Design a protein around this ligand. Sequence first.
Ligand SMILES: Nc1ncnc2c1ncn2[C@@H]1O[C@H](COP(=O)(O)OP(=O)(O)OP(=O)(O)O)[C@@H](O)[C@H]1O
Ligand SMILES: [Mg+2]
Length: 247
Amino acid sequence: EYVFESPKMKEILEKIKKISCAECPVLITGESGVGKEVVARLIHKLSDRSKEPFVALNVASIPRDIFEAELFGYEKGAFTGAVSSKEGFFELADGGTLFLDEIGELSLEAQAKLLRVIESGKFYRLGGRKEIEVNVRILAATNRNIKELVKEGKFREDLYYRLGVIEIEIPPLRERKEDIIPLANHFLKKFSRKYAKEVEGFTKSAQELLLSYPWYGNVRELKNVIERAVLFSEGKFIDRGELSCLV
DNA sequence: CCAGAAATTGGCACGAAAATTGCAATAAATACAA
Ligand SMILES: Nc1ncnc2c1ncn2[C@@H]1O[C@H](COP(=O)(O)OP(=O)(O)OP(=O)(O)O)[C@@H](O)[C@H]1O
Ligand SMILES: [Mg+2]
């Protein structure tokens, strides 16, 4: 279960409901730990293809020298040492969703190779002759400022225009103050059962302290703080002093 | 008989198709050691 109790978050949820049945690539931008993975999996879940694979990938974990071999696949005998034919991630997520986390780590050649497939919709194996057609829905998430990347000369402008048809910008947690308290009480329970420590809630002073801290890690930092508070406590209530050192 | 007209020939051209040549080292089945 997730928490959406802020007007901006509710509007984003309505946008997700409207868009989840479309057939266009989605780009999710935001700060660190805002919930981009949550938004991507919520888009996939509320979809007509929710019973299909959701291939999540990190583009920085794929070496350049074999990049196009991983994404598209190769045939037997394509290169020395190719024991047997193998498929790519595009065919693996055929009929489902392909999620690319931190899309800003791509190189220019990889960007062009991805743009060709996103435009045409069909590709070829590394050592193949027939042409493969796929039905992959592409979601891409990043935390960089993509406009500054394209202005500097690091991200292809046409690729950004192709991907940036729909923009979902999750606001920072510091602009979601009315969402801070329901989140903390959500985490405090989850760890309390997990670590078997007994605790009920936060005192008024601790709740006042929570709303004043300008979170830089957004939801993940709040989760870490709540986990530390649960671990380093034994009483039924968390007070100002327990969180004062953490903050 | 003659001069104009018609027929013959082969050199050059042009697009296409066929033949020739450069490349030089791997892949898989099999037997043996822990
Ligand atoms: N509404 C929510 N309710 C509960 N937990 C949430 C909610 N939104 C986000 N989280 C939690 O926030 C954590 C970090 O979020 P997420 O995985 O989406 O990060 P991210 O935005 O992709 O981060 P990064 O930009 O650093 O890659 C997750 O563990 C997730 O459970
Ligand atoms: Mg992420």
